[PDB]
Amino acid sequence: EVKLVESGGGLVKPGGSLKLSCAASGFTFSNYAMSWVRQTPEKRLEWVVSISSGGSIYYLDSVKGRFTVSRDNARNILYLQMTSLRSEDTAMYFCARVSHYDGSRDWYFDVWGAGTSVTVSSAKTTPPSVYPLAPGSAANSMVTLGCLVKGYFPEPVTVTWNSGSLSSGVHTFPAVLQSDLYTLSSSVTVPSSTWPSETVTCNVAHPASSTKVDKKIVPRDC
Amino acid sequence: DVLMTQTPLSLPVSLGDQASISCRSSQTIVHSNGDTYLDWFLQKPGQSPKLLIYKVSNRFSGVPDRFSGSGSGTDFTLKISRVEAEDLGVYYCFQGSHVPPTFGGGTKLEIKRADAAPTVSIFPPSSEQLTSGGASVVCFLNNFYPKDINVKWKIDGSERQNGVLNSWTDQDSKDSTYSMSSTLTLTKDEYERHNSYTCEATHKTSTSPIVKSFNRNEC
Ligand SMILES: CCNC(=O)N(CCCN(C)C)[P@](=O)(Cc1ccc(NC(=O)C(F)(F)F)cc1)O[C@H](c1ccc([N+](=O)[O-])cc1)[C@@H](CO)NC(=O)C(Cl)Cl
Numbered sequence A: 001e002v003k004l005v006e007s008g009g010g011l012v013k014p015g016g017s018l019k020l021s022c023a024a025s026g027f028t029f030s031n032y033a034m035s036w037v038r039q040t041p042e043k044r045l046e047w048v049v050s051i052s053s054g055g056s057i058y059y060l061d062s063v064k065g066r067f068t069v070s071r072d073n074a075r076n077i078l079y080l081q082m083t084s085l086r087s088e089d090t091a092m093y094f095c096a097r098v099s100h101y102d103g104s105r106d107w108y109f110d111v112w113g114a115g116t117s118v119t120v121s122s123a124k125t126t127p128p129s130v131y132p133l134a135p136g137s138a139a140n141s142m143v144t145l146g147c148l149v150k151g152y153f154p155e156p157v158t159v160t161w162n163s164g165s166l167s168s169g170v171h172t173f174p175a176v177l178q179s180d181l182y183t184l185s186s187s188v189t190v191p192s193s194t195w196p197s198e199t200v201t202c203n204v205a206h207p208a209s210s211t212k213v214d215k216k217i218v219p220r221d222c
Numbered sequence B: 001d002v003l004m005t006q007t008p009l010s011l012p013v014s015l016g017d018q019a020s021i022s023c024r025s026s027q028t029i030v031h032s033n034g035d036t037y038l039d040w041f042l043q044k045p046g047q048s049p050k051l052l053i054y055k056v057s058n059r060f061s062g063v064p065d066r067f068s069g070s071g072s073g074t075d076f077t078l079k080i081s082r083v084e085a086e087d088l089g090v091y092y093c094f095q096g097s098h099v100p101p102t103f104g105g106g107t108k109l110e111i112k113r114a115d116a117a118p119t120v121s122i123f124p125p126s127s128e129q130l131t132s133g134g135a136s137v138v139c140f141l142n143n144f145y146p147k148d149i150n151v152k153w154k155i156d157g158s159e160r161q162n163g164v165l166n167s168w169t170d171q172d173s174k175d176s177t178y179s180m181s182s183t184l185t186l187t188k189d190e191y192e193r194h195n196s197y198t199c200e201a202t203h204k205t206s207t208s209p210i211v212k213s214f215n216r217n218e219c
Helices: B127-131
Strands: A004-009 A010-012 A017-027 A032-038 A045-051 A057-059 A067-072 A077-082 A092-097 A109-112 A117-119 A129-132 A144-154 A160-163 A170-172 A176-178 A181-191 A201-206 A211-215 B006-007 B012-013 B020-026 B038-043 B050-054 B067-072 B073-082 B087-097 B107-111 B118-121 B134-144 B150-155 B159-160 B164-168 B178-187 B195-201 B210-215
Touching: A004 A092, A004 B107, A017 A032, A017 A092, A017 A117, A032 A077, A032 A109, A032 B073, A045 A092, A057 A067, A077 A092, A109 B050, A129 A201, A129 A211, A129 B127, A144 A201, A144 B118, A160 A181, A160 B195, A176 B067, A176 B164, A181 B107, A181 B127, A181 B134, A181 B164, A181 B178, B006 B087, B012 B020, B020 B038, B020 B087, B038 B067, B050 B067, B073 B087, B118 B195, B118 B210, B127 B134, B134 B195, B134 B210, B150 B178
Parallel strands: A010 A117, B012 B107
Antiparallel strands: A004 A017, A017 A077, A032 A045, A032 A092, A045 A057, A067 A077, A092 A109, A092 A117, A129 A144, A144 A181, A160 A201, A170 A181, A176 A181, A201 A211, B006 B020, B020 B073, B038 B050, B038 B087, B067 B073, B087 B107, B118 B134, B134 B178, B150 B159, B150 B195, B164 B178, B195 B210
């Protein structure tokens, strides 16, 4: 039953605070060093802190004086109390077991949790504007249509075509943060013999704001 | 801190091929106790990293013998004797000898496939967006390979990068190609001030740029 489960992630404004927890099971938690490792949106891995079995603590210089790690050996829980949060602290935080006990000549991350997402932003929940992307009709065997999901926050948004009945030929691009708000786009390619004849609709869902938009892609001249 | 440099950033392979990833540190990774804590991790999409090799050459439990680690001091190598489908992902080396422990930037092992030119589509701003005072011109560059591509927007023959949002998909598990979306956002005012909107892509598949244009006067 060796597993690590992180919780406590979410949205916080810069300067804010948050406490992450990592529940351990399947091993004698007390006999091992533990660590928090974060992965930025750019996928860069950065070690944050290590707390040895004996309690020796090592912090990344940038979090010193801002983060406090601690462990409860009775409940097998590792904590990370973050304060004075900055935008660059935005990342996926993983707890990891280090196969080390004080004085051991070996140490390495052998078990990792699934991670918990932390997002530091001043932005507030904002529903998306969904726009149909249709080719200028006055302008081939296949036609590409799309939908632009612009200016929303926070992630994520889900996009399907024809409520899922259209799965082939679809590309959904990863969201990109612009001026604190995300923008995403999706394209779908279908045989020219089916559109406009047959209807194509993009379904966009943004859970954060309970938004569900269905936008039909209709032909039109520019 | 100790800087871990991995090369290459992306490694295209075909299943069955042998693969080597290099990891070099800016300083010796040998610890005061004489051991070298150089570890390698593999991270697959949507998954947490998983240990493969620790302390330079020791394979972790359950890792297939196809993985080998070697090196000394400041130069290390991860070798995959035969690449299988399940080996695709991002590989990271890590030094845990000196505080702060640091990770290399990652090496993406990708599937090599034949070159493919992008299929480019350009979209004028929708009437609905114009109503709200905005104007986004969208360009999709789909199913191309390799991933290296440069897209430029030209408004009436003049380049414009400000207000452009670019996004790339990961390698398609179906045809191993990449796709890209490029959005140029202007104010309604600016948009109706110009006539030609051009999405220009430079890709190794052609000696001249792949150009898709939208001229308002021709609508
Ligand atoms: C000032 C006190 N001195 C030291 O601290 N060290 C000696 C420095 C000597 N130089 C100045 C010349 P150092 O080498 C510093 C160091 C700390 C962490 C890591 N890596 C990770 O944390 C991981 F991320 F890579 F795992 C690597 C190095 O400590 C080692 C260490 C390894 C692993 C863990 N752990 O996992 O928790 C804790 C401590 C080890 C001595 O060796 N200590 C112990 O076992 C004590 Cl008895 Cl607890």
